[PDB]
Amino acid sequence: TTNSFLKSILIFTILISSTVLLVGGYWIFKEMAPRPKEVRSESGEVLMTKETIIGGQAVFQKYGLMDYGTVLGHGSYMGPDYTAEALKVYTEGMQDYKAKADLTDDEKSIIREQVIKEMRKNRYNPVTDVLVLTDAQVYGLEKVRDYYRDVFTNGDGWGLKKGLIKESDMPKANRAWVADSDQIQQIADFFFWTAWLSSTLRIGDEITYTNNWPYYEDAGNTMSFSAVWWSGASVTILILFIGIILYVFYRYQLSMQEAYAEGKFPVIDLRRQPLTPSQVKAGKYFVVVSALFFVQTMFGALLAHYYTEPDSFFGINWIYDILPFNIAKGYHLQLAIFWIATAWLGMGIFIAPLVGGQEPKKQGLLVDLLFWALVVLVGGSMIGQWLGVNGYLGNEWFLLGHQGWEYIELGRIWQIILVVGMLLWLFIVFRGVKRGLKRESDKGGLIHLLFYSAIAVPFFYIFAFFIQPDTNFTMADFWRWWIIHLWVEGIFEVFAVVVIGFLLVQLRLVTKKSTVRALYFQFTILLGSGVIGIGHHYYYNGSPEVWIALGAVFSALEVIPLTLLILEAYEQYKMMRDGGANFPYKATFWFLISTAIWNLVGAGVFGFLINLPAVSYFEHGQFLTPAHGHAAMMGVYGMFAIAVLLYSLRNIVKPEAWNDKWLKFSCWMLNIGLAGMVVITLLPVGILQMKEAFIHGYWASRSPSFLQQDVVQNLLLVRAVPDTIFLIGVVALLVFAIKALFHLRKPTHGEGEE
Ligand SMILES: CCCCCCCC/C=C/CCCCCCCC(=O)O[C@H](COC(=O)CCCCCCCCCCC)COP(=O)(O)OCCN
Ligand SMILES: CCCCCCCC/C=C\CCCCCCCC(=O)O[C@H](COC(=O)CCCCCCCCCCC)COP(=O)(O)OCCN
Ligand code: HEM
Ligand code: HEM
Ligand SMILES: CCCCCCCCO[C@@H]1O[C@H](CO)[C@@H](O)[C@H](O)[C@H]1O
Ligand SMILES: CCCCCCCCO[C@@H]1O[C@H](CO)[C@@H](O)[C@H](O)[C@H]1O
Ligand SMILES: CCCCCCCCO[C@@H]1O[C@H](CO)[C@@H](O)[C@H](O)[C@H]1O
Ligand SMILES: [Ca+2]
Ligand SMILES: [Zn+2]
């Protein structure tokens, strides 16, 4: 019964938090805004069907518009937020209709006040799944309908391609998820719906389906009491647990303990370290991620450029033609997850034999096969997205094209091959680790924790399948976050962490006992806050008001594990020094230290800058999000993948040919460029955008007009300095990765024994 209490706590933590998530997931499904079978006029004339709404949404996904603009605050920022934009047109129309822009202030005052009392009342009948909206509202739906035809025909005057939506892209009828009916009448309908629920009070409630989001006086949308109350409450509870957790941490020495006495640093003679065929093979895996990282960055360089030159890349043409923003955005995200994720899969391949003590038969065969599987998935899924967004696909867009969800842009069949790949990956890990699991008595020991977490990789991605074109937006978004917030960060904050403990225990740098106890404490505080903390993504996506409290409180608690960081980085810096200038893993530790600090700064402080519900009310879907997004994503996960990538490359390259000079330069260039792009550009624009929404309405902050202000542009223009500096750091890595195959070692043992 070695770490019994810690296990109960962890198990209990996972059990309780999972329940709350599921219950809250149920409350959403049951309280989210409805998609009436028929929405119609006072004359009884139907204008909308649940099937239309589902269709509009479908074409929105079909054309990957979530990689251009947003809806309900989620998606890209080049374009506007259709919900807020559609809401304005619809609101403006209701004004004109009742206006029968020239009235007196004393006059426009009366009308705008009239449209307020009229549009915020729920006219949906639960007994009968049908909604009826006044004439003043139908006239508004018209302006909305007209507005977007113009848009999806003439363009939006900023980055969006002309007449991108065309019937010729899909069959006469019998269209996959989109309905038999004009496509750009469905979209306008989808947008109108999100705008409908964002401005209409919840039945019996006093605020709307989105807790009064977006901010917009003319529609009566203003900050809710819960948004302000939970801002204070969440932080007070955080203060309460910081003290509590700190005490627990201090009293049980729940951290790694050095395994060596003063001056007795362990010898790391890499020359006499067993190496195997599957490991050397996993070595080239890293050069590819290094390459994908290179392209991923490039697309980022392209996206940033488009904020200054909307329809061209320095006058050139094909670029905005074949690689427009939405498409480029998709690849940027897709490749980020791809290169970071597969860096750890490789790391898994690499240590697998070490855990077992030998090379599994056909390991190199399986490894090599896994290799050409992703390479296909990647090259393939991307081709798919191009064909899909462009229309050179039929009803195969959802299966092979662009699924239409930011972060989840690949097609369903592309997702299927993904899981099988991970499943295969899992098998490969298990094959090499299997015997370790057998030697390890304690079923909750290092190797078991390493294996349990390894399986969460493929498994947890399966929740994505609860998502498909006809799913209600807020409910589908609910599941999307299980992948973005729980999965990606489950790949990294659990699997990676146990992998590092394993490595440090192997190098004989920290006691094994010390390490597993530490992992238990972290996992419990990590899952104890983060599982429910997922809810801060549900503040305004249409979810019930209860998630404002749940999300605010639990995401705030996510900061606790983060503070036991700047000081963990130091313990690591410390042991890095205990190893002289001949310490083999310098480069690795510099990136390790870097991820801890960015975890405090990028996720901890920049993430919190936008976490308060009071703040997020205005900020949600603005530049501060990407500010935090890069600081955390690249700062934490990118650096971590790199640390592990260099760690493996070190056990593979011939020492004599190794030089971490270039890596020092990379580390410096990457860190400086990341901070610079955040601080010099993303942050100041984020503030302006939030101020602009606070004073004129959120619609004004998401209009291309905002991006056009000279002040914004200049801020946008100087992003090039730090962006170029960051770029240089990645090429230096790439160059070091590539010309690293030229100095590889060859397997020491085969299917033998270490
Ligand atoms: C909006 C603000 C966000 C700020 C986020 C900043 C993130 C902090 C970055 C930390 C990088 C840590 C890198 C490892 C540091 C520990 C090991 C180390 O520094 O050893 C250095 C070489 O290190 C190295 O060669 C490692 C490279 C160090 C490069 C640091 C550049 C980061 C600048 C961050 C501020 C813009 C040896 O020389 P010394 O000056 O004696 O080392 C002591 C200094 N730590
Ligand atoms: C909504 C979802 C939220 C996220 C939930 C998943 C999070 C995944 C990430 C990390 C999970 C780490 C889980 C570690 C739990 C360890 C519990 C445990 O081992 O307790 C053990 C028995 O374990 C056992 O006998 C086996 C039980 C533990 C392993 C079961 C499989 C778990 C894999 C789950 C991944 C999908 C008690 O007895 P032992 O000490 O092992 O045995 C005697 C030792 N002398
Ligand atoms: C030369 C460096 C880079 C540049 C110039 C850059 C630029 C950009 C731009 C312009 C966007 C637009 C988001 C939008 O308007 O919708 C973006 C989003 C994003 N980037 Fe990058 N990027 C760079 C590096 C990276 C790296 C290294 C990672 C991590 C592996 C990363 C992760 C992301 C993520 C997750 C988003 C989406 C966040 C959001 O939409 O709020 N980026 N980036
Ligand atoms: C290493 C850990 C973390 C990573 C990689 C990360 C990454 C990201 C990314 C990429 C986004 C943009 C999502 C999108 O495109 O819509 C985002 C949004 C967000 N993150 Fe994090 N995050 C981390 C930790 C945290 C923490 C600790 C907090 C709590 C303070 C937090 C709060 C938020 C919030 C509130 C948003 C939503 C912004 C909006 O709706 O406008 N994050 N995060
Ligand atoms: C979320 C925080 C969970 C904290 C769990 C602490 C479990 C402490 O457990 C205790 O650790 C002592 C050594 O420090 C041992 O001597 C005790 O026998 C053991 O019961
Ligand atoms: C600090 C965290 C406090 C969380 C309080 C959650 C209170 C949930 O309260 C429940 O909300 C449901 C809708 O989601 C309603 O249908 C239920 O009737 C209501 O009791
Ligand atoms: C993105 C640009 C990547 C450039 C990588 C250049 C890698 C050069 O690599 C070098 O090439 C030489 C022959 O020219 C060989 O003799 C060296 O052994 C080899 O390391
Ligand atoms: Ca986004
Ligand atoms: Zn989150």
CA distances 318 to 165, 300, 640, Å, are 20, 18, 36
The ligand whose atoms approach the alpha carbon of 77 most closely is 3
Q: How far apart are CA 119 and CA 497, in angstroms?
A: 51
Query: What residues have CB less than 8 Å from 494, skipping those under 6 apart?
Result: 453, 456, 523, 526
Residue 385 is labelled as binding a ligand: no
Give me ligand 3 centre to Cα 306, in Å.
13
Q: How far apart are CA 447 and CA 653, in angstroms?
A: 27
Strand partners of residue 49: 38
Residue 620 is labelled as binding a ligand: yes
What is the CB < 6 Å shell around ligand 6?
27, 31, 544, 546, 549-550, 553
Strand partners of residue 316: 313
Does residue 742 have its Cβ closer than 6 Å to ligand 7?
Answer: yes
3-class DSSP state of 16: helix
Q: How far apart are CA 359 and CA 276, in angstroms?
A: 6
Does residue 607 have its Cβ closer than 6 Å to ligand 4?
Answer: yes
SS (H, E, C) 631-699: HHHHHHHHHHHHHHHHHHHHHHECHHHCCCHHHHHHHHHHHHHHHHHHHHHHHHHHHHHHHHHHHHCHH
Residue 630 is labelled as binding a ligand: yes
Cβ atoms of 54 and 570 closer than 8 Å:
no
3-class DSSP state of 124: strand
Cβ atoms of 203 and 92 closer than 8 Å:
no
Tokens of 160: 């969006």
3-class DSSP state of 120: coil
Give me ligand 6 centre to Cα 623, in Å.
32
Query: How would you list the strands of the sheet with 38-40, edge to edge?
Result: 46-49, 38-40, 130-132, 124-125
Cβ atoms of 233 and 549 closer than 8 Å:
yes
Q: How far apart are CA 430 and CA 281, in angstroms?
A: 17
Cβ atoms of 290 and 738 closer than 8 Å:
yes
For the stretch 494-514, what's the b/e string if a residue is b when 16 or more beta carbons lie within 10 angstroms of its beta carbon?
A: bbbbbbbbbbbbeeebbbbbb
Strand partners of residue 132: 40
Q: How far apart are CA 306 and CA 677, in angstroms?
A: 16
CA distances 189 to 86, 90, 121, 433, 611, Å, are 10, 11, 19, 53, 31
* Amino acid letter for position 620: H
Cβ atoms of 366 and 423 closer than 8 Å:
no
Cβ atoms of 674 and 697 closer than 8 Å:
no
In Å, the largest CA–CA distance within the chain is: 89
Tokens of 229: 């109350």
Q: How far apart are CA 726 and CA 294, in angstroms?
A: 11
Q: Nearest 5 degrees, angle CA 439-CA 440-CA 441?
A: 105
The ligand whose atoms approach the alpha carbon of 293 most closely is 3
Tokens of 322: 């074949």
Q: Whose CA is nearest to atom 15 of ligand 1?
A: 590
Residue 403 is labelled as binding a ligand: no
**Any idea of the CA torsion for 539, 545, 546, 548, to the nearest 10 degrees?**
30
Residue 485 is labelled as binding a ligand: yes
Which helix (H) or strand (E) segment holds residue 1: the answer is none
Tokens of 414: 């592309």
Does residue 444 have its Cβ closer than 6 Å to ligand 2?
Answer: yes
Which helix (H) or strand (E) segment holds residue 97: the answer is helix 82-98
Does residue 513 have its Cβ closer than 6 Å to ligand 5?
Answer: no
Cβ atoms of 380 and 414 closer than 8 Å:
yes
**Domains (range + CATH), the chain:** 1-32+223-754 (1.20.210.10), 33-222 (no CATH)
The ligand whose atoms approach the alpha carbon of 680 most closely is 1
**Any idea of the CA torsion for 124, 125, 128, 134, to the nearest 10 degrees?**
-50
Cβ atoms of 733 and 666 closer than 8 Å:
yes
Cβ atoms of 205 and 162 closer than 8 Å:
no
Cβ atoms of 291 and 605 closer than 8 Å:
no
